[PDB]
């Protein structure tokens, strides 16, 4: 009967709530009343890369912290050298409505996706020196939101049909499918060891997934509206989430609940992009009021502002050795800060 | 080996200049409507697991690209932000009474969204002959769904088409008046709505889109001069 199943669900939820409330003894703000504030952090623009014709939606850094890829709503994907502002590659796409990009850890491949429900994989270094389309992966029933590489032969995607998938490239077939969300899946992040990954999915919920098996391990709730960006902490034992309710939060995978909230009484705009720093002390976030904010991740008090853009800030990224921070926005420019 | 790098950068810049010149003179439109409407007929009415369909046409040596949404779910609050820089949104409505309230609500929600407050809408009230036959026959009564049709009279400055019953004129202008009231409720003056009447077999839609796009760009140009 439906009533019995609903009652069992309610009882399980109440047991979960009791066991969860039986674990909050100390708050993060009370154990951290002896931490020196980082002080004001002033950042200056060192470079400005120009060349796009419409709004940018994504960017990924290279493994060497020198080369980067950018994707725009005009059908182009550019590979830049950041030291000298040179252009190393320009690639035209079959579709103009791009929403994601990824750069291979070995530097040999790139990938892209969007509103055509298809993931395209391009080869970089060939004998002729020309960039050619190597693979097209199809099978999703909704628009793709993000994609990340594991190696030269496996990839992971998340789509707007409430699903994620693990793909084999050479054969061209799906290998695993992860299901269980309720709304659109908006972002996924990969662990440093590449065995677990987390997803945020537009119903005020987040989940953690195991790759080799295909099952859900744990889920987290607490936001009031959709979830927009997600990323891991350096040690792989935490992650941070932004939402369309103008709040940021920090979640942990062992205590299995919420730790810290970043918010303000003046901020009434959501959060678009989030990424941590090398040490895990600065949390950088993009907002829909034209500027980026730099948050002390342990004190929940603002520490800096970056205010050089003229439109919505969409994408933001940090290097592999910690040097530069790159931001891209809806005004077709891209800025390097150090 | 800096010289080779600079040479490659210059070649890429030349290519990007050609691409920009081509890109800057193509207009982009977005098509919206309901399943029981006839937007597919309009798509097949215009001549020069896929997630999006594209059609191309050319009028007076100007190139239009139009886009339609295919295999997607029915929640639209995330991929509707990809169309904030298009020239126009084309909204098609089945004006044969009942689901007109859903159409009103959808148009109202499109009109008030933050990322679409600067974008103009071209309104097609399709399904004309069915409306004519339905209202003329009189089996179903419009007064049941909308009580305000119990006092409305045709404005004295109306310009009806020849050979037409006054009843169908009252009906059609009442339905248009509802949409225009929702349109001018805000009263801001930054974007405009354009209503039209269309049927299943017509051959004059490209010209209408053409003329409204010309008016849109004229307003945008006049605002640059601080001259409006």
């Amino acid at each position, epitope marked *: 009967e439906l009533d019995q199943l609903r009652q069992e669900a309610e009882q399980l939820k109440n047991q979960i709530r009791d066991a969860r409330k039986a674990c909050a003894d100390a708050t993060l703000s009370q154990i951290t009343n002896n931490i020196d504030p980082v002080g004001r952090i002033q950042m200056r623009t060192r470079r400005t890369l120009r060349g796009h014709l419409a709004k940018i939606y994504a960017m990924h850094w290279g493994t060497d912290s020198r080369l980067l890829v950018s994707a725009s709503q005009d059908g182009k994907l550019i590979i830049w050298d950041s030291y000298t502002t040179n252009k190393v590659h320009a690639i035209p796409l079959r579709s103009s409505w791009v929403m994601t990009c990824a750069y291979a850890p070995s530097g040999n491949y790139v990938a892209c996706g969007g509103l055509d429900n298809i993931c395209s994989i391009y080869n970089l270094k060939t004998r002729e020196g020309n960039v050619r389309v190597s693979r097209e992966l199809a099978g999703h029933t909704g628009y793709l939101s993000c994609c990340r590489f594991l190696d030269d032969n496996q990839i992971v995607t998340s789509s707007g049909d409430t699903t994620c998938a693990l793909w084999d490239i050479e054969t061209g077939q799906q290998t695993t499918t992860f299901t269980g969300h309720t709304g659109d899946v908006m972002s996924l992040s990969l662990a440093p060891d590449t065995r677990l990954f987390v997803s945020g999915a537009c119903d005020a919920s987040a989940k953690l997934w195991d790759v080799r098996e295909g099952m859900c391990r744990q889920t987290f709730t607490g936001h009031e509206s959709d979830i927009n960006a997600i990323c891991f902490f350096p040690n792989g034992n935490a992650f941070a989430t932004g939402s369309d309710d103008a709040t940021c939060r920090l979640f942990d995978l062992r205590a299995d609940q919420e730790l810290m909230t970043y918010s303000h009484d003046n901020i009434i705009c959501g959060i678009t992009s989030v990424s941590f720093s090398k040490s895990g002390r600065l949390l950088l976030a993009g907002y829909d009021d034209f500027n980026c904010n730099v948050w002390d991740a342990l004190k929940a008090d603002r520490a800096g502002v970056l205010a050089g853009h003229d439109n919505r800030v969409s994408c933001l990224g940090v290097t592999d050795d910690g040097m530069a921070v790159a931001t891209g926005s809806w005004d077709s420019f891209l800025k390097i800060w150090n | 080996e800096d010289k080779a790098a600079v040479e490659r950068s210059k070649m890429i810049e030349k290519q990007l200049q050609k691409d920009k010149q081509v890109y800057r003179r193509t207009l982009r439109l977005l098509l919206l409507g309901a399943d029981n409407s006839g937007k597919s007929t309009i798509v097949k009415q215009m001549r020069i697991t896929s997630g999006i369909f594209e059609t191309k046409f050319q009028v007076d040596k100007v190139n239009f690209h139009m886009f339609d949404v295919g295999a997607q*779910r029915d*929640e639209r609050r995330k991929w509707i932000q990809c169309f904030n820089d298009v020239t126009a949104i084309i909204f098609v409505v089945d004006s044969s009474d009942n689901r007109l*309230q*859903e159409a009103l609500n959808d148009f109202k*929600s499109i009109w008030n969204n*933050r990322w679409l407050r600067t974008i103009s809408v071209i309104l097609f009230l399709n399904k004309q002959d069915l409306l004519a036959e339905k209202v003329l026959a009189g089996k179903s009564k419009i007064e049941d*769904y909308f009580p*305000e049709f119990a006092r409305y009279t045709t404005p004295e400055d109306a310009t009806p088409e020849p050979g037409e019953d006054p009843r169908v004129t009252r009906a059609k202008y009442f339905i248009r008046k509802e949409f225009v009231d929702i349109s001018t409720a805000s009263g801001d003056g930054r974007h405009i709505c354009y209503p039209h009447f269309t049927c299943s077999v017509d051959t004059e839609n490209a010209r209408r889109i053409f003329n409204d796009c010309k008016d849109i760009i004229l307003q945008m140009n006049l605002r640059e001069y601080n001259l409006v």
Partner: nanobody, 128 residues
Framework: QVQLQESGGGLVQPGGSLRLSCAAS????????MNWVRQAPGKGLEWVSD????????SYTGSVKGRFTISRDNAKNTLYLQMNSLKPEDTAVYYC?????????????????????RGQGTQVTVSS
């Protein structure tokens, strides 16, 4: 964890009267816009009335003009529908609805495919 739960309803003769009251938990109550929805046998999802943040803007569908009244109770976190002088075509299941975002005036909340922040509903039956 967004939660909405309805109360009231039941059986009532034609020309009767009842009061539908709905309670919420898991979010601030004032920043949002709220709506009423009902579903009749052999139909889809409909719409009835809406009320804004302060209660100073109201909107009704034509079929319940002069019949039903909507109320926001901020302090007690409640939404109210007074319903009177009925017809047999009001027999339906009834849900509340919350807008997806705060500090805005737009709604995309009728979807069959499991809109998230929607209630379970109550049954209203009218006969004699």
């Amino acid at each position: 964890q967004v939660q909405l739960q309805e109360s009231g309803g039941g059986l009532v003769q034609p020309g009767g009267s009842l009061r539908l009251s709905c309670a919420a938990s898991g979010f601030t109550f004032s920043n949002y816009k709220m709506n009423w929805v009902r579903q009749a046998p052999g139909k889809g999802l409909e719409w009835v009335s809406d009320i804004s943040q302060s209660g100073a803007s109201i909107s009704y569908t034509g079929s319940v003009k002069g019949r039903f009244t909507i109320s926001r109770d901020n302090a007690k976190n409640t939404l109210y529908l007074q319903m009177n002088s009925l017809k047999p075509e009001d027999t339906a299941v009834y849900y509340c609805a919350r807008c997806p975002a705060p500090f805005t005036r737009d709604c995309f909340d009728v979807t069959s495919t499991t809109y998230a922040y929607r209630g379970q509903g109550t049954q209203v039956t009218v006969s004699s």
